[PDB]
Design a protein around this nucleic acid. Sequence first.
RNA 1: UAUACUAACAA
Length: 122
Amino acid sequence: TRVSDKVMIPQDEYPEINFVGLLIGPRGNTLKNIEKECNAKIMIRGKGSVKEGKVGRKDGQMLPGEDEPLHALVTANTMENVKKAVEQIRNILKQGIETPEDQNDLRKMQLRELARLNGTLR
RNA sequence: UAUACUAACAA
């Protein structure tokens, strides 16, 4: 008895940017956070998901990157738990680094969650 | 020049 629900990333305009980053966190703060909240399982699948085609780490495609577009598959037990979980996740992607007019100034805040956490805050 | 980027977990 497990429910699934991934978050679609606007790969039509943006590649994967901090969508995978912010959604993850340092090592995976955002991932484990929502995981400990509604008992969900965050796992981004697609091109830029497991830092296999980005910078920082080593290069060398290991997982197929021609099928999955760019989404963060979040599992759980009930649709309710995964629902609220996906909600926050959207607040991270939907806004990403080009957050709506609601904020915009805090567009870089998605990087502060990790920064202020590891002292990486300006 | 934190001018913040973090990639895990899984695949």
